[PDB]
């Protein structure tokens, strides 16, 4: 009862048979979730649509992922992954930002319980690859406690709203290292031209930052 089900795709697929010729079936993709981190998706197949709905939603609850949420409203860090040919770039956002994501991502995020996130989908926009990529990215995120334990250092959060106050969000359960993390003068991290182009005021799109209904 705590789980809600949402349809993501309903497709009429066809196979050719020797006797009956062009045969019609239904392929359904549904996502399930309880809004508290437990969510999953499953494909459903049947000749009738209502049978595909039953198979998909009932199967999905046996294939649930648990998705960690930062402060139970957003993801722990920016997630950039490719699943086959579908690229998904997700950004951690503060409260009140809402879900500014592909409509299917909005639907899935409400089932997980994510309230604030930005996402951009590029490449092949395939619902099944988008859904499967989304759950892979969200399942493989490192929490702050995991980061603190891995590096044996405190995880300190700095907020411009709170000024210079250092907010310890996670501390290592084991011993605490005494050697500061090396400060590389210049990081050898790969950057996305879209993020850099935007931060420089060079990304000029009539479609970006448009006024939309609350999501």
């Amino acid at each position: 009862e705590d789980f809600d089900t949402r349809i993501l795709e309903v497709r009429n697929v066809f196979t050719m048979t020797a006797k009956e010729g062009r045969k019609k079936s239904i392929r359904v993709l549904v996502a399930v979730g309880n809004g508290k981190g437990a969510a999953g998706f499953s494909i459903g197949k049947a000749t009738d649509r209502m049978d595909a709905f039953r198979k998909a939603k009932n199967r999905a609850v046996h294939h649930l992922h648990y998705i960690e949420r930062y402060e139970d409203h957003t993801i722990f860090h920016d997630i950039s992954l490719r699943f086959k040919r579908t690229h998904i770039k997700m950004k951690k956002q503060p409260k009140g930002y809402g879900l500014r994501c592909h409509r299917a991502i909005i639907t899935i995020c409400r089932l997980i319980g994510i309230k604030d996130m930005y996402a951009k989908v590029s490449g092949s926009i395939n619902m099944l690859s988008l859904t499967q990529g989304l759950f892979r990215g969200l399942s493989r995120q490192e929490t702050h406690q995991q980061l603190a334990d891995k590096k044996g250092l405190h995880v300190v959060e700095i907020r411009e709203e709170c000024g210079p106050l250092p907010i310890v969000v996670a501390s290592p359960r084991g011993p605490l290292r005494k050697d500061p993390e090396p400060e590389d003068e210049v990081p050898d991290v790969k950057l996305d031209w879209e993020d850099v182009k935007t931060a420089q005021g060079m990304k000029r799109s009539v479609w970006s930052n448009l006024k939309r209904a609350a999501t």
Binding site: K91, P94, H154, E157, R159, G163, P180
Partner: protein, 295 residues
């Protein structure tokens, strides 16, 4: 001979700085404003203690007390009386020197009246003209209605005394009559309802204490400090009171009895305190709980 201390004396600033207190959670409360995604750092116990030390320094700047100034004297200076211009204009002219590199209290702002008199603009005209041509963030040319008595009581009912003072500081000059009247009305509502904790860890606590000490009404604040186990602050309060009222019954009593520590509060409670009975009781209770902890 013997001068009484000023608000900005190093001795008074140190006493009032400690009585104020520093709470990093309150001083850096999360502001309700446009937000950005937070940043994260991996820190050792030393790097964290250093980051917390810097936050304390940034807070001591944010808690810098505004100077307490006396009311400004009205400006009534006539520069010229050109009677030949009498009745030639129906509306007066206000001339403001907008030369960029001049302090605002040194800017000549004059008014040509319909009578022909060239006079210096009044303090109220000055602050209005400076806002027109040198607009300051948070200041309005017309006085906001929040400062009406009916609207300040609403802010007091919500325990928003610190917002009232932030609004008053942004709108009025420290020597203005509105700035002083609003601060005094706010300090009085705190004393009547015992809301002294609303100003702790803020830059407005010292100005509030200065008001109570000069007006000989520290009984409420002294009780509040004892009920909160702040006897060090309660003892400094009675010492600050003696420093600013040396020729007083309590100051002499402390000299005659060479009182120190908690004894100062007992001497003050008997001689000058109006609520002397409620202080001894409040102080008695504290000594008991302190003995229970010792035993």
């Amino acid at each position: 001979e013997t001068k009484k201390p000023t608000f900005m004396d190093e001795e008074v600033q140190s006493i009032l700085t400690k009585m104020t207190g520093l709470n990093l959670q309150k001083t850096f409360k999360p502001a309700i404003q446009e937000l950005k995604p937070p940043t994260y750092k991996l820190m050792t116990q030393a790097q964290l203690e250093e980051a917390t030390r810097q936050a304390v320094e940034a807070a001591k700047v944010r808690l810098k007390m505004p100077p307490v100034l006396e009311e400004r004297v009205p400006i009534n200076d006539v520069l010229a009386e050109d009677k030949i211009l009498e009745g030639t204009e129906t509306t007066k002219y206000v001339f403001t020197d907008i030369s960029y590199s001049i302090p605002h209290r040194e800017r000549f702002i004059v008014v040509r009246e319909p009578s022909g008199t060239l006079r210096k603009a009044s303090w109220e005209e000055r602050d209005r003209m400076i806002q027109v041509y040198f607009p300051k963030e948070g200041r309005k040319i017309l006085t906001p209605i929040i400062f009406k008595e009916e609207n300040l009581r609403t802010m007091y009912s919500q325990d928003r005394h610190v917002d009232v003072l932030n609004l008053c500081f942004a709108q009025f000059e420290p020597d203005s009559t509105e700035y002083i009247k609003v601060h005094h009305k706010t300090y009085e509502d705190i004393d009547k309802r015992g809301k002294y904790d609303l100003l702790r860890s803020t830059r407005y606590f010292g100005g509030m204490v200065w008001y109570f000490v000069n007006n000989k009404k520290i009984d409420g604040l002294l009780i509040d400090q004892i009920q909160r186990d702040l006897i060090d602050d309660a003892t400094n309060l009675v010492q600050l009171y003696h420093v600013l009222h040396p020729d007083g019954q309590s100051a002499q009593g402390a000299k005659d009895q060479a009182a120190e520590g908690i004894n100062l509060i007992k001497v003050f409670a008997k001689t000058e305190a109006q609520k002397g009975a409620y202080i001894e009781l409040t102080l008695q209770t504290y000594q008991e709980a302190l003995s229970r902890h010792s035993a």
